[PDB]
C-alpha cells in the first residue's frame, strides 16, 4: 500500500535539500553541481529553475519573503523573480576548496548549514575540512565545531530540546542537547550507527512522531529511526540507488519527497534506473511529518 512514484524526472546531477512550501503547495530543491535551485508546484506540475555562479547546496524559506540558500561558502538571500542573490555572510574564509553541504532552519529561525571539502568523490575529498555554522536572524554567524568530514542531514526534536546531526563518513546519526533560546548545542552522542547495507547516511528529517527518516546514499532507501530507543523501525526501498535526502510535504505532510543523484552512475545503472536524479514521492506510509521552519532574518 506504499506507493513510490517519480513526480518529476528532473535527472538531477545531485538532487538535494527538498523543502515543502505549504503556502504554495510547492517543493523546493537543489541540484548541487548544476548550481541550480528548483521550485515545483504540486498543483500545476510546473517547475521553475534558477542557476547560480557556484554550487548551491541547500535552500530554505525566508519568512520576510523569498528564500535563503547556501551558494559556495556563502549564506545568501534569493529573490526568485529578480533572479538575484545577496550575500548575507561568508564562511570557511581560510579553506580554499570548500563548499556548504546540507542546511536547514532551526525552530528559532536560524539557518544551520555545514561545510565540507569539495569532492572528486565520497571518501574522496580532503578529510575533516568542514565545520557546522548557523546564520542567526541578526546575520551573525556562529561556528559550532570543526573537523567535519561531510556535513549532512540535520533536524530538531519536536519539543525543541534536541538537535540531530549527520557527518556522513562517521556512519552515525548523532544527537546534541539544544537550547532554543540561544542556539547552543552540547553533549554530542551517537543515537544510531548504520548497518553496512545502509551505506552512507545523507539527508534526514524528523516526523510528527519524533522519529527520524534518513536517506541512504548508494543504499537506495530511506530508513526510519527511533532516536530514543536507538532502533531502526522501518526500511523503504526506492527504485534508484543514490537516494540523497527526504522531507515530508503534500496534504497534511502525509507524503514523503525523496531526492537522488544521477552523477557517478555507469550506463548500466542508468539503464535499470532511468529515473535516477528524479524527485520521488512516497505515499501510504501512515506517518506524517511537520512543517519546515523559515529563516527569521
- State the binding partner of 196 from a copy of itself, Ca ion, none, CB within 5 to 8 A by kind: a copy of itself
Stretch of residues binding Ca ion (CB under 5 A), selected from 110-118, 133-141, 190-198, 202-210: 202-210
Interface positions, 101-160, toward a copy of itself (CB under 8 A) = 123-124, 127-128
Cell numbers describing residue 112: 544551520
Residue 39's alpha-carbon distances to 57, 145, 174, 217, 292, in angstroms, are 15, 32, 30, 23, 15
* Bridge partner residues of 142 (DSSP): 134
Phi first, then psi, for residue 169 (nearest 5°) are -80, 10
Is residue 202 part of the annotated active site? The answer reads yes
Nearest to a copy of itself of 122, 137 (CB atom)? 122
Of residues 21, 31, 102, 106, which one binds Ca ion by CB under 5 A? 102
Name residues contacting a copy of itself, limited to 176-215 (CB under 8 A).
Answer: 190, 193, 196
Q: Hey, CA dihedral for 42, 47, 52, 57, is it positive or negative?
A: positive
- State the minimum distance, in angstroms, from the CB of residue 220 to a copy of itself: 17
Q: How far is 165 from 150, CA to CA, in rounded Å?
A: 11
Q: Are 240 and 202 in contact (CB under 8 A)?
A: no
Residue among 80 and 171 whose Cβ is closer to a copy of itself? 171
Q: Using the rule CB under 5 A, give the single segment among 34-42, 77-85, 195-203, 230-238 that binds Ca ion.
A: 195-203
Nearest to 241 by CA among 261, 223, 225: 261
DSSP string across 255-271: EEEEEEB-TT--HHHHT
CB atoms within 10 A of CB 121: 8
Q: Given the rule CB under 5 A, which of 22-30, 92-100, 131-139, 203-211 is the region that contacts Ca ion?
A: 203-211
Quick note: the x/- pattern for Ca ion over 44-83, rule CB under 5 A, is ----------------------------------------
Candidates 20-28, 85-93, 100-108, 265-273 — which segment interacts with Ca ion by CB under 5 A? 100-108
Site for Ca ion (CB under 5 A): which residue of 201, 203, 277, 292? 203
Q: Of 171, 179, 237, 270, which one interacts with a copy of itself (CB under 8 A)?
A: 171
Distance CA(98)–CA(96), nearest Å, equals 6
For 112, other C-beta atoms within 10 Å of its C-beta total 25
Q: Is 119 annotated as a binding residue?
A: yes
**Is residue 76 helix, strand or coil?**
strand
Binding-site sequence positions:
16, 99, 101, 119, 152, 202
Annotated binding residues for a divalent metal cation = 16, 152, 202
Binding-site residue positions for substrate: 99, 101, 119
* Catalytic site positions: 202
Amino acid at each position: 500500500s506504499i506507493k513510490i512514484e517519480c513526480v518529476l524526472p528532473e535527472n538531477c546531477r545531485c538532487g538535494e535539500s527538498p523543502v515543502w512550501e505549504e503556502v504554495s503547495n510547492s517543493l523546493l530543491f537543489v541540484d548541487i553541481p548544476a548550481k541550480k535551485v528548483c521550485r515545483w508546484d504540486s498543483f500545476t506540475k510546473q517547475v521553475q529553475r534558477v542557476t547560480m555562479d557556484a554550487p548551491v547546496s541547500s535552500v530554505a524559506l525566508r519568512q520576510s519573503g523569498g528564500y535563503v540558500a547556501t551558494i559556495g561558502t556563502k549564506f545568501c538571500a534569493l529573490n526568485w523573480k529578480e533572479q538575484s542573490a545577496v550575500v548575507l555572510a561568508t564562511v570557511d574564509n581560510d579553506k580554499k576548496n570548500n563548499r556548504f553541504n546540507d542546511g536547514k532552519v532551526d525552530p528559532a529561525g536560524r539557518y544551520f548549514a555545514g561545510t565540507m571539502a569539495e569532492e572528486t568523490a565520497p571518501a574522496v575529498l580532503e578529510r575533516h575540512q568542514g565545520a557546522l555554522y548557523s546564520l542567526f536572524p541578526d546575520h551573525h554567524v556562529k561556528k559550532y565545531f570543526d573537523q567535519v568530514d561531510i556535513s549532512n542531514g540535520l533536524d530538531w526534536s519536536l519539543d525543541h530540546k534536541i538537535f540531530y546531526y549527520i557527518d556522513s563518513l562517521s556512519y552515525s546519526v548523532d544527537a546534541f542537547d539544544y537550547d532554543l533560546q540561544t542556539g547552543q548545542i552540547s553533549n554530542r552522542r551517537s543515537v544510531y550507527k548504520l548497518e553496512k547495507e545502509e551505506q552512507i547516511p545523507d539527508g534526514m528529517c524528523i516526523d510528527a512522531e519524533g522519529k527520524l527518516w534518513v536517506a541512504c546514499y548508494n543504499g537506495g532507501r530511506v530508513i526510519r529511526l527511533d532516536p530514543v530507543t536507538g532502533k531502526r523501525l522501518q526500511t523503504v526501498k526506492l527504485p534508484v540507488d543514490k537516494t540523497t535526502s527526504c522531507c515530508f510535504g503534500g496534504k497534511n505532510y502525509s507524503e514523503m519527497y525523496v531526492t537522488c543523484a544521477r552523477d557517478g552512475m555507469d550506463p548500466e545503472g542508468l539503464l535499470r534506473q532511468p529515473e535516477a536524479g528524479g524527485i520521488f514521492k512516497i505515499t501510504g506510509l501512515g506517518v506524517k511529518g511537520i512543517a519546515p521552519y523559515s529563516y527569521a532574518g
